Amino acid sequence: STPFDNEFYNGLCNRDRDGNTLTYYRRPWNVASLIYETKGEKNFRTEHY
């Protein structure tokens, strides 16, 4: 879990206007930045002898 307080914020709300739907989130002052990079991939392999 988190070893520190992650709810406190310093001053003017820093917007996090991104995501799948239309909703506005907040970024705490403890975190420098929180991007919403929705990457996705997979892998496969086959071995025979």
Partner: protein
């Protein structure tokens, strides 16, 4: 031979050998490994991932 005294004698030998040898060895080995990995930074969490 006989001379009128007779002496008798007779011999006949026969030998035969039949030898045979055969060897067969067959080896067949096949190995194939194919790996396909695709990294896609498209921007879809579930649908893009699939």
């Amino acid at each position: 031979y006989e001379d009128k005294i007779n002496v008798g004698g007779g011999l006949s030998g026969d030998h035969c050998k039949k030898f045979g040898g055969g060897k067969t060895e067959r080896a067949r080995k096949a190995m194939a490994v194919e790996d396909i990995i695709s990294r896609v930074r498209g921007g879809s969490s579930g649908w893009s991932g699939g």
